[PDB]
Amino acid sequence: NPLSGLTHKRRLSALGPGGLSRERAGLEVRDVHPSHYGRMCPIETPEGPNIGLIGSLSVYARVNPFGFIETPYRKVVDGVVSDEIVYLTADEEDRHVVAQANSPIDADGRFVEPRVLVRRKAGEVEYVPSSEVDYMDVSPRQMVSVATAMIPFLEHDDANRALMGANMQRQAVPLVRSEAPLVGTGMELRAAIDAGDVVVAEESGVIEEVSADYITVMHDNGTRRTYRMRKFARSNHGTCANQCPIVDAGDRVEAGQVIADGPCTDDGEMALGKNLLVAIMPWEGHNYEDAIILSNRLVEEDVLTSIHIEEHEIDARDTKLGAEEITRDIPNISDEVLADLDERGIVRIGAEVRDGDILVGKVTPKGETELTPEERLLRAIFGEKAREVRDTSLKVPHGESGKVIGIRVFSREDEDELPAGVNELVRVYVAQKRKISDGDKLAGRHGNKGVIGKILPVEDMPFLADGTPVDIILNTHGVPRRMNIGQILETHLGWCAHSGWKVDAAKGVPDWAARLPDELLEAQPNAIVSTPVFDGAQEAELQGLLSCTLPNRDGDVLVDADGKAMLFDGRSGEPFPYPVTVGYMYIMKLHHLVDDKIHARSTGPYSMITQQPLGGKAQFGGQRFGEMECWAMQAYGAAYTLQELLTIKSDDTVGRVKVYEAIVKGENIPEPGIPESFKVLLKELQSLCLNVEVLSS
């Protein structure tokens, strides 16, 4: 998504050529240093065996001409805060007694209180010398990166959950629609703009003509410019890169204005997921241990759905026997599976293909070989010829499906640059519209991840007294101990933003709303709001806005001041005995879809030097049965299953076809032999001039 690309930039990796390696890197470089404040994010960081070695540059950080990282600070002079922004590197910061951003200012430029919080040279945050502090933070969120600056209520999340939310915002797949969050931050718009995946007008002008493929704009002085959208393009990771205009045919647009939103953008601001009506109760053990149960509305209305484009490449080359041809004359294969293939081979555009279908019909020469007597007799009986050319056609790999967007054909005969010794290279793009299904991974912005355990029908879904079913149900057992209460805060605020509010300022402003910014005292229903990272909606303000939640359609407040709604059971029909925390949570669909995770094998390719079939879903891979698993089997006392696994399932090349025959013919599975890897080991040892011999007795 645009955020993933933006954060791949602004990434500082402490490893590479001439840098620390994960193994040689100690444990003191991975930690957070006081000098990181404002120069490198302490939160955003990989959670695997790379924590600390890779970080993200903070929002305001800048790079010194010498390579050091500078950070801005407001020069405060004689206790008087100023606007002069000096960019200090870590060294200069240590020599200055730098204050903190949220230090109240008397509006005269001077601190309205003694005892202003400060940092000092040794990185120690401690008591403060009032007055005569030389510098002050430019603004809050100076220490967070762009990804971490998009987590509302970050200050209410533990560093672990904030880290996971930051690392998981970058995994959200681009949905078909994309909705700007009800609760967001100020970083959404800037992140989308600067990511570069959203079209921005270069110069002011009036939109002359807008269509779904390009926008022609007439500038203020004669000249006109045409921006061409990138429709249904494939990204490096297989997602969709669709761009659609967001401007009419007469609008005047100024320079730098967004005029066509990108993959994960809504009206120019980043949109990684969808706002879903959420209940925070435990429900029948289906949302057990960070599992999620979704309404079927989310599959019917198609709100969590992603277009995935997969490219398959095949190149006809020059071989000893001759050259490979791409045509619809594949040997021995019928006229049914040669149906969609065009007159020239490669399949047609828009032809639905399921796993195993033929995409590109290729035929490589075989060279004379020795047909068995049985096959020669059969060919004579059925009157055929060897054809002397084998098939190496490209086929939809196992488990895949989809339409066929477009074919890109490069050819030497048409003088297109191709590697040496290849005549043609054809790429077919196959697009599938994935719908959310159990096994797919979802998450909010607060590290509240989880796979989908079940997708309930809308009718057996808890519904508010109004009758609106809830879309998602998270578990209450995951909030208190993971220390990411921020999500709950978000939920409440989301609901308020969805409903709209009116603070009753009949007799002045309520004491809890005195410091609220003007014009927030009244918000129309479905009003997008922002809570910046470390200055946001305080809990008292949230309580107040939750109290005044102007009614949905009749006079009926579905959520009391406590934030909990009385839900009706979808199946039983009785109301649940106690209210349930209901709101609107902005949840993303992570790119860990079960369709790419499922894999199975009964027999397939075997490795070259050893058997023990190839590993990997990309091949037809067997699941590694390591030493820990073998110890577990030994502890169970199950000797026969372990021998079976390590001999005939994996390595023994004679008992393998024998077990296949026994299974297919109903006979007993045969006795296992010597694994091939042991004889490989014996030969390796002997070739080391070590006389190893297996004495009979």
Binding site: V59, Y60, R62, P72, R74, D83, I85, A101, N102, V138, S139, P140, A180, G184, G186, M187, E188, L189, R190, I193, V253, E254, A255, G256, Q257, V258, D266, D267, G268, E269, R515, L516, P517, E519, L520, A523, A527, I528, V529, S530, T531, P532, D535, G536, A537, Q538, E541
Partner: peptide, 21 residues
């Protein structure tokens, strides 16, 4: 700041001196 943007109202109580770079 950006010419045409959604009007996302903020709960922010602190003005920012420096625009994001």
């Amino acid at each position: 700041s950006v010419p045409g943007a959604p009007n996302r109202v903020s709960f922010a109580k602190l003005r920012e001196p420096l625009e994001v770079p």
